[PDB]
Amino acid sequence: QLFNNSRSDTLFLGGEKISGDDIRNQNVLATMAVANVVKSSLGPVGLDKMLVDDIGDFTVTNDGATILSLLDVQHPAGKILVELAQQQDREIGDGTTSVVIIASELLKRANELVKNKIHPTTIITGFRVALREAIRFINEVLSTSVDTLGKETLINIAKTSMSSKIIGADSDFFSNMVVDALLAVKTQNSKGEIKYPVKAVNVLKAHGKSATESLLVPGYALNCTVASQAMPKRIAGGNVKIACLDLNLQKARMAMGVQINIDDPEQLEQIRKREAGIVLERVKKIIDAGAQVVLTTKGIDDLCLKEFVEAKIMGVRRCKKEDLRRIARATGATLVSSMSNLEGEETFESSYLGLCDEVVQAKFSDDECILIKGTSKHSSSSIILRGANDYSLDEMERSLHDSLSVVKRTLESGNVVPGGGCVEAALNIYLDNFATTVGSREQLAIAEFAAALLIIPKTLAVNAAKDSSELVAKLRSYHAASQMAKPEKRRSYRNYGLDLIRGKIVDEIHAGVLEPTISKVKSLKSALEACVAILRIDTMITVDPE
Amino acid sequence: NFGSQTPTIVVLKEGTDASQGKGQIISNINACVAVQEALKPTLGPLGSDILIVTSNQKTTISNDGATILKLLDVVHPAAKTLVDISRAQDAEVGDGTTSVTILAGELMKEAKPFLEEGISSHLIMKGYRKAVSLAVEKINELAVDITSEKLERCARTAMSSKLIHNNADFFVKMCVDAVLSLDRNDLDDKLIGIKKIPGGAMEESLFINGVAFKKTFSYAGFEQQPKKFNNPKILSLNVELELKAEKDNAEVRVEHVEDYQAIVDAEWQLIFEKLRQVEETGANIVLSKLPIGDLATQFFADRNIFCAGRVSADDMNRVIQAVGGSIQSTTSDIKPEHLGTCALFEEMQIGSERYNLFQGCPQAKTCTLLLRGGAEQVIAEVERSLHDAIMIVKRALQNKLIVAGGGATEMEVSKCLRDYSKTIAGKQQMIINAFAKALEVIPRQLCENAGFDAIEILNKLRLAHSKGEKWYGVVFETENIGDNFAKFVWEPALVKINALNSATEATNLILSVDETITNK
Amino acid sequence: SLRLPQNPNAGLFKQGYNSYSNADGQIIKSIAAIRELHQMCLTSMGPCGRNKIIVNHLGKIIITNDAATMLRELDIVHPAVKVLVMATEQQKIDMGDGTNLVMILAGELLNVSEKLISMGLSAVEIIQGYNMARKFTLKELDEMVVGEITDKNDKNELLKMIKPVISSKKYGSEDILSELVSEAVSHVLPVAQQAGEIPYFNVDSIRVVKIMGGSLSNSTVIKGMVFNREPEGHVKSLSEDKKHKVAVFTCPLDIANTETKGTVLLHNAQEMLDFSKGEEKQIDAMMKEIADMGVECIVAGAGVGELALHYLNRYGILVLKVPSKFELRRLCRVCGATPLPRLGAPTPEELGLVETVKTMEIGGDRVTVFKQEQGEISRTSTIILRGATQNNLDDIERAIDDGVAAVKGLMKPSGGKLLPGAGATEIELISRITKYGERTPGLLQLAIKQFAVAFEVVPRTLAETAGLDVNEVLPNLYAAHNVTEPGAVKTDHLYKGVDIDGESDEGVKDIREENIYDMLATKKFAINVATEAATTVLSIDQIIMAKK
Amino acid sequence: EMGRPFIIVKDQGNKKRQHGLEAKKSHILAARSVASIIKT
Ligand SMILES: Nc1ncnc2c1ncn2[C@@H]1O[C@H](COP(=O)(O)OP(=O)(O)O)[C@@H](O)[C@H]1O
Ligand SMILES: Nc1ncnc2c1ncn2[C@@H]1O[C@H](COP(=O)(O)OP(=O)(O)O)[C@@H](O)[C@H]1O
Ligand SMILES: Nc1ncnc2c1ncn2[C@@H]1O[C@H](COP(=O)(O)OP(=O)(O)O)[C@@H](O)[C@H]1O
Ligand SMILES: [Mg+2]
Ligand SMILES: [Mg+2]
Ligand SMILES: [Mg+2]
């Protein structure tokens, strides 16, 4: 800002070194420049944004995780929120939009706190002491997953994640698909602990029909093409055996770097015939075992295709390594890298073959996929998305991916908190009376931390093209009276949030908006570490490349 | 249809900027805050100064909000509003130009989080226009009639933040008698004029009852004229005394050689005729705007009559008021009663420059000071402090009012505004309480330049307004906070009145503009 | 296949010439080009309208919300936009009122025409739809008029005319800006009631002097003209009163010079000795006749020589410099004097009367006070305008001129003819044209019904700029007009209008108490110019440009 | 910066600004260079 500083007077540096308040001023502008994007994308009233690669392709991404990933930011402090948005996907998987706005606001309001001459250690302590009481307050206001007789939770859990997305209007239809997909892919480990392998549900891209007609596949759907067209396209009957092999079925050279030297010319043909015969020995054991479908990681040579057509076996080549591991557990088959055992003999055992109800290959809009349904050993699920184009399905692919991570946190930990600015507004009133007790120089730091969390509920009303004050002023009326609501349920005054469609304050429990409690704990801790690292930088030194 | 190109018509000419979107009005706020960043450390007597060098390599050191903005050329449309309020505050009152820009920029900074919300642009201006109405009426309660006690205190506080402030035990004594020589309803701004002499020490300056001007020209008969007069008579003349064509045209037609000699002798007699009429009236000093050749100067040397020329029109206007004389554009109308006089006339050399000293007149409205200093800016900063200090005691003669300074004004006005926001609205209460905190930037930033803790000061200001009443303010010497009435620090009310009206008008102007178009 | 034929026989015209026709969506692009500058003036409409900053090539900044002033400095490219630009300038010159209405109304007629063209309506049928609907619109404005100004000058009545006009331009405080303009109007009125004389008014009579510094509350009204001038010889407060006799000379004061080859001719030294004293007796003889008539002040129109200024200081006569022309012309209207070129003794009947002439410091410089008093009234009064920023001083000067132009509307027609304000004028026309569209059989009813839809922009703009939802507020206003008229007379529902902020939900009860009204003479030409502006764009099937 | 050129004063990049301790150190060393010349 203003005029550039002089370059290394008596300092004798080859790069640029700026000191004073100019560093902290540019550090705030770094977080404010990347925030103005994420800001307008927050809430159900948020709008998608389009990023262009200048090569002719566009990318529509609502959340700030991929937006900050695609946008190149060369500012040293600007890369913190870029890595923070990429981080939020790793732990929780959702909240990349809220973690960037909060972390940018913690630094924004702290820019006026350093003008007071307050040292950052007082500012950092004021944010940490207020955070320790904030995490404890969230655990006190949480609600149990019991609620009424029926579940009435997991359906509402997905509807919160479906907000801010184009499919948000269809969230009523996609609510039952996400819940039924995660419950089928559940596993068990740690002697009774249930785990949820996110990404195990296949997301397929199809064109035509509509997103409301997308059918949930009761099983795994493999994306690939049939080896030979002479194979039967549909396989019926119960107990369908599936073979998953990681070994090359194509003819390969002998050993690796050896050399074949032949003296007697009569053996020139017999040696070459054996190289092609060894490959078909592994196929003969598969045909005699009764395997209907043969899944191979690598390609399949024409020598192995003639044996599958005559035996009415469906061959599949060029399979992903991560895709076949999920097929083995679901169908019950054991992954076979090679045919061998402890004994010196080589044979194929029928126990390595899986079982399912039906194997059929479906073709819709140039997309060919084999539908494996009715797995007896372990159930699975797959979702086939239908939309305008591939880029229209790119946002729908990440929309359902974020919904799988939100439901996972509610099943592991049944503690949930209401959305719509309930947590951010409740922490303000709790920290107002707490700051008056400490006093001294930490009272202003805690007061600004409670006001910094107000950016989330205020962003909802700004993006809705409505009056923000009347919504926030009435919002505080319930939360300010909630701390003074006093014991005796008749308490109420809590779990209230903004309704952006109707412009009223209603109960979020009856509205069907809930958010995992762990999502609030990991977001406030990750957003603070981004602000603490920036407030501690006195001088930025940029060395020119050689 | 005339070509396969078929260009697309653009509404605006190429080179025009864009607007609307989000952040266009925010761009105007950050432009004013960045300008405010330079003027904040210059606030307060312990504040610093800013060194500015223009494209002409002209060194100027100023902490004044008006002078700093005149040096830099501001091409930003919204940032030029701070320049207008700085020049408007300096024109009338002359003081507070730095405080107006700091206050006007803070009103935009406190309105920045309101624009990001759903608050309309006109709703914010409703808070500032209503609060300034009750703020002006609050200043009238701060001020006192002070018809009792009969310039000394207000002139010392005006020199703060600027040079010679520590010398106020000296220069202030000259500022008191400077404006007192000016009668009511006149109060001429030229008669207080001050001349700058490069070189010397500023403590060697002295007070003069009349104008002193530079000769700017060396006459061949100058030294033959006495430089010390016991009872001089000053005569102001617009005539031009020398040998030259008379009026606007020169031509001569002479047929005979005998008549050719009379033409030359006639030119000498006409020029000498104007010289004899001056001697018959006994005028010891002759001043003229038009040049005067060595012919008229040497004639005045034998008669012991002082002669001068080249004097600017602004300096001779001070001569008529100093000696009570009159301007005579012809030598035939000179009468004895139109000549002024004084007690004595002595020519003293100051910094290799000789000046004419007019002093000792019974009644003189002219005040001219001779300033010295090492740097060329030192002599400029002193007059810059004296010119601003005279306008403070100038406005005090029309109305005598005292308002406690040192942040005591903004804290008392903001107290009654928080009570007004408590009684009514609640939609506007967020804006009014923001205006009360926006007035606190003046006492907060003024205490940051002294290195004192702002938290300890501001916390002790708010709770102390019960027993402190209106006069409770900050004390620099004892590092404590105590009544400024006992500290004698005073200040007129006209400084704070124009400061609140200029900051509100400049803030509401930009908040009402959401679009800025720049052609070419 | 690699390169196009690139429009063969295109060499008939220069490469800079381009052809644009109503076909190929260019008539839609022309309407879309209007919306670029249309939204600029939408946020500037009403008392809550937002001013705009426009920087020209010379660096001058003019901050105003007036559509006619903003379009002057902007460089326009699209030809049909200049039709809309020059249409708003005529409204400011003619009536001096309703400039933002012509800009918005003419732009909305093209927006509703985009749907009319898409349905297949020819350009001829669309023009006939607006012309027949405008004739019915002008007839309904005279039926809906309420109240009248009656007497020319009144203290209260001038608050129902100038005040609602200046409320949109630099709103600020209401009664502060209304009293300054209303005071200067009462001085320039000849009054002379019961005499039956024809009233007269001049829009250039009231002059606004921009002086930086101070505050708006410190402004006042001066009956005389105020200039920045420095008296030459001396300054005089003229406390000896008994008024004064003043004379005005459009010619400079100096010895008369021959227009051809002015030269001093001296044959002998005898004529040279009397040449210096000869010119001194000429000015003495001429200025003595003026001083004998009791003339204490002389107004000069050019540079005055020093020899002439000497004798003027002898008798204590003030000297005034009036450069150019118009500055000196309005000086004689104040004192009622007749200029004469000669330097001789003026006629006593042509001498003016000014009681006091004062010189004081206002904005830091010496200004001369021509202010008049209760008796011997004067015309062309000036208004001292104090402000912190010069940018605000420019638009307030145009805001006062809007109030001065509103006084002109009280002269030519039979009366003021007040109309309901707050957008109630354009809303009532919607229900009347809707009934008029049904009474006309044929296909012309499509353009007539959509002509009333364009009037919905006035309530939507006032509601949007006020921070209110146009979906909640606008339909609630039709509830007053949907009940039509009852079985009894005296229906006050015509006073319903749009409210700014506050409690919303319609509001301001009946605007009769708010006193804000509109001028009928302004709405007559505002609709005619805006209709012809949109008609001209729709009547052009092909547009041709040069060099670009 | 938000993507638009921000210029408060003409000749932005031409003029430089010094502040803090570095501005005071440059002023003292400027006098030391003049002093050591005059001290000889
Ligand atoms: N139906 C709803 N009503 C009100 N608020 C909601 C609703 N759905 C989500 N929100 C709020 O929007 C915020 C963002 O939600 P979401 O879009 O799921 O995360 P992200 O914005 O990180 O993708 C949450 O904090 C939540 O409080
Ligand atoms: N001796 C003093 N004690 C306390 N406060 C002072 C003193 N001198 C000046 N101030 C305060 O400093 C502020 C700025 O004064 P000044 O420098 O004259 O104006 P500016 O800063 O606009 O140039 C004033 O508002 C005044 O209250
Ligand atoms: N306080 C108010 N309340 C309601 N309506 C108003 C108010 N002030 C002005 N208006 C309306 O807004 C309109 C603005 O007119 P405008 O186009 O600005 O005229 P001009 O362009 O001549 O200044 C006026 O016709 C008036 O009826
Ligand atoms: Mg989300
Ligand atoms: Mg000062
Ligand atoms: Mg108007």
PDB file of N, CA, C and O in Angstrom, chain A residues 134-160:
ATOM      1  N   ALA A 134     -15.183 -22.484  24.202  1.00  0.00           N
ATOM      2  CA  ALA A 134     -16.132 -22.690  23.114  1.00  0.00           C
ATOM      3  C   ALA A 134     -16.328 -24.170  22.815  1.00  0.00           C
ATOM      4  O   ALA A 134     -17.457 -24.611  22.575  1.00  0.00           O
ATOM      5  N   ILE A 135     -15.243 -24.949  22.822  1.00  0.00           N
ATOM      6  CA  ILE A 135     -15.357 -26.384  22.573  1.00  0.00           C
ATOM      7  C   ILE A 135     -16.145 -27.055  23.690  1.00  0.00           C
ATOM      8  O   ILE A 135     -16.944 -27.968  23.445  1.00  0.00           O
ATOM      9  N   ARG A 136     -15.938 -26.611  24.931  1.00  0.00           N
ATOM     10  CA  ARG A 136     -16.698 -27.163  26.047  1.00  0.00           C
ATOM     11  C   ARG A 136     -18.167 -26.763  25.975  1.00  0.00           C
ATOM     12  O   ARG A 136     -19.041 -27.547  26.359  1.00  0.00           O
ATOM     13  N   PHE A 137     -18.456 -25.554  25.486  1.00  0.00           N
ATOM     14  CA  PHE A 137     -19.843 -25.120  25.361  1.00  0.00           C
ATOM     15  C   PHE A 137     -20.582 -25.900  24.282  1.00  0.00           C
ATOM     16  O   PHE A 137     -21.783 -26.159  24.420  1.00  0.00           O
ATOM     17  N   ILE A 138     -19.889 -26.279  23.205  1.00  0.00           N
ATOM     18  CA  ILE A 138     -20.528 -27.055  22.147  1.00  0.00           C
ATOM     19  C   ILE A 138     -20.912 -28.439  22.658  1.00  0.00           C
ATOM     20  O   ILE A 138     -21.976 -28.969  22.318  1.00  0.00           O
ATOM     21  N   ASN A 139     -20.058 -29.040  23.490  1.00  0.00           N
ATOM     22  CA  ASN A 139     -20.366 -30.349  24.053  1.00  0.00           C
ATOM     23  C   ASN A 139     -21.521 -30.297  25.043  1.00  0.00           C
ATOM     24  O   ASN A 139     -22.160 -31.327  25.285  1.00  0.00           O
ATOM     25  N   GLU A 140     -21.798 -29.131  25.629  1.00  0.00           N
ATOM     26  CA  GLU A 140     -22.931 -29.008  26.537  1.00  0.00           C
ATOM     27  C   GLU A 140     -24.250 -28.835  25.794  1.00  0.00           C
ATOM     28  O   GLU A 140     -25.293 -29.281  26.283  1.00  0.00           O
ATOM     29  N   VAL A 141     -24.226 -28.198  24.617  1.00  0.00           N
ATOM     30  CA  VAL A 141     -25.453 -27.902  23.883  1.00  0.00           C
ATOM     31  C   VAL A 141     -25.789 -28.955  22.835  1.00  0.00           C
ATOM     32  O   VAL A 141     -26.771 -28.787  22.100  1.00  0.00           O
ATOM     33  N   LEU A 142     -25.008 -30.027  22.736  1.00  0.00           N
ATOM     34  CA  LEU A 142     -25.280 -31.048  21.737  1.00  0.00           C
ATOM     35  C   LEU A 142     -26.566 -31.804  22.066  1.00  0.00           C
ATOM     36  O   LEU A 142     -27.028 -31.836  23.211  1.00  0.00           O
ATOM     37  N   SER A 143     -27.143 -32.419  21.038  1.00  0.00           N
ATOM     38  CA  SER A 143     -28.363 -33.198  21.167  1.00  0.00           C
ATOM     39  C   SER A 143     -28.086 -34.654  20.821  1.00  0.00           C
ATOM     40  O   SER A 143     -27.268 -34.957  19.946  1.00  0.00           O
ATOM     41  N   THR A 144     -28.775 -35.554  21.517  1.00  0.00           N
ATOM     42  CA  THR A 144     -28.599 -36.978  21.280  1.00  0.00           C
ATOM     43  C   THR A 144     -29.255 -37.392  19.965  1.00  0.00           C
ATOM     44  O   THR A 144     -30.155 -36.725  19.447  1.00  0.00           O
ATOM     45  N   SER A 145     -28.787 -38.517  19.425  1.00  0.00           N
ATOM     46  CA  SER A 145     -29.315 -39.039  18.171  1.00  0.00           C
ATOM     47  C   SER A 145     -30.612 -39.818  18.347  1.00  0.00           C
ATOM     48  O   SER A 145     -31.231 -40.185  17.342  1.00  0.00           O
ATOM     49  N   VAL A 146     -31.024 -40.089  19.586  1.00  0.00           N
ATOM     50  CA  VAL A 146     -32.265 -40.804  19.864  1.00  0.00           C
ATOM     51  C   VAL A 146     -33.442 -40.049  19.261  1.00  0.00           C
ATOM     52  O   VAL A 146     -34.090 -40.532  18.326  1.00  0.00           O
ATOM     53  N   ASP A 147     -33.723 -38.859  19.798  1.00  0.00           N
ATOM     54  CA  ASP A 147     -34.810 -37.988  19.336  1.00  0.00           C
ATOM     55  C   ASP A 147     -36.122 -38.750  19.478  1.00  0.00           C
ATOM     56  O   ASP A 147     -36.434 -39.198  20.595  1.00  0.00           O
ATOM     57  N   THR A 148     -36.908 -38.923  18.419  1.00  0.00           N
ATOM     58  CA  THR A 148     -38.190 -39.604  18.503  1.00  0.00           C
ATOM     59  C   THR A 148     -37.989 -41.112  18.351  1.00  0.00           C
ATOM     60  O   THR A 148     -36.862 -41.616  18.362  1.00  0.00           O
ATOM     61  N   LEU A 149     -39.093 -41.850  18.223  1.00  0.00           N
ATOM     62  CA  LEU A 149     -39.056 -43.299  18.048  1.00  0.00           C
ATOM     63  C   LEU A 149     -38.230 -43.675  16.824  1.00  0.00           C
ATOM     64  O   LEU A 149     -37.176 -44.307  16.950  1.00  0.00           O
ATOM     65  N   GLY A 150     -38.701 -43.295  15.639  1.00  0.00           N
ATOM     66  CA  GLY A 150     -37.959 -43.558  14.425  1.00  0.00           C
ATOM     67  C   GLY A 150     -36.665 -42.768  14.360  1.00  0.00           C
ATOM     68  O   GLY A 150     -36.374 -41.907  15.192  1.00  0.00           O
ATOM     69  N   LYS A 151     -35.864 -43.087  13.342  1.00  0.00           N
ATOM     70  CA  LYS A 151     -34.582 -42.421  13.139  1.00  0.00           C
ATOM     71  C   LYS A 151     -34.762 -40.915  12.994  1.00  0.00           C
ATOM     72  O   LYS A 151     -34.414 -40.156  13.904  1.00  0.00           O
ATOM     73  N   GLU A 152     -35.323 -40.483  11.861  1.00  0.00           N
ATOM     74  CA  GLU A 152     -35.576 -39.066  11.586  1.00  0.00           C
ATOM     75  C   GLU A 152     -34.313 -38.221  11.737  1.00  0.00           C
ATOM     76  O   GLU A 152     -34.374 -37.048  12.112  1.00  0.00           O
ATOM     77  N   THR A 153     -33.155 -38.814  11.448  1.00  0.00           N
ATOM     78  CA  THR A 153     -31.887 -38.104  11.562  1.00  0.00           C
ATOM     79  C   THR A 153     -31.101 -38.173  10.260  1.00  0.00           C
ATOM     80  O   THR A 153     -30.874 -37.147   9.612  1.00  0.00           O
ATOM     81  N   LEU A 154     -30.687 -39.385   9.870  1.00  0.00           N
ATOM     82  CA  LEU A 154     -29.829 -39.550   8.700  1.00  0.00           C
ATOM     83  C   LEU A 154     -30.454 -38.960   7.443  1.00  0.00           C
ATOM     84  O   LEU A 154     -29.732 -38.508   6.547  1.00  0.00           O
ATOM     85  N   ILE A 155     -31.785 -38.956   7.352  1.00  0.00           N
ATOM     86  CA  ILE A 155     -32.442 -38.297   6.229  1.00  0.00           C
ATOM     87  C   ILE A 155     -32.208 -36.792   6.290  1.00  0.00           C
ATOM     88  O   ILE A 155     -31.947 -36.147   5.267  1.00  0.00           O
ATOM     89  N   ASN A 156     -32.283 -36.212   7.490  1.00  0.00           N
ATOM     90  CA  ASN A 156     -32.046 -34.784   7.660  1.00  0.00           C
ATOM     91  C   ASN A 156     -30.566 -34.429   7.666  1.00  0.00           C
ATOM     92  O   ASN A 156     -30.219 -33.277   7.384  1.00  0.00           O
ATOM     93  N   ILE A 157     -29.689 -35.384   7.987  1.00  0.00           N
ATOM     94  CA  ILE A 157     -28.252 -35.121   7.949  1.00  0.00           C
ATOM     95  C   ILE A 157     -27.799 -34.840   6.523  1.00  0.00           C
ATOM     96  O   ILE A 157     -27.010 -33.920   6.274  1.00  0.00           O
ATOM     97  N   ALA A 158     -28.291 -35.626   5.561  1.00  0.00           N
ATOM     98  CA  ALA A 158     -27.888 -35.434   4.174  1.00  0.00           C
ATOM     99  C   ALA A 158     -28.454 -34.145   3.592  1.00  0.00           C
ATOM    100  O   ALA A 158     -27.800 -33.509   2.758  1.00  0.00           O
ATOM    101  N   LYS A 159     -29.655 -33.744   4.018  1.00  0.00           N
ATOM    102  CA  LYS A 159     -30.270 -32.536   3.475  1.00  0.00           C
ATOM    103  C   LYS A 159     -29.447 -31.293   3.785  1.00  0.00           C
ATOM    104  O   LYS A 159     -29.473 -30.325   3.016  1.00  0.00           O
ATOM    105  N   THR A 160     -28.715 -31.296   4.901  1.00  0.00           N
ATOM    106  CA  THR A 160     -27.852 -30.162   5.218  1.00  0.00           C
ATOM    107  C   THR A 160     -26.666 -30.094   4.263  1.00  0.00           C
ATOM    108  O   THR A 160     -26.284 -29.007   3.814  1.00  0.00           O
TER     109      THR A 160
END
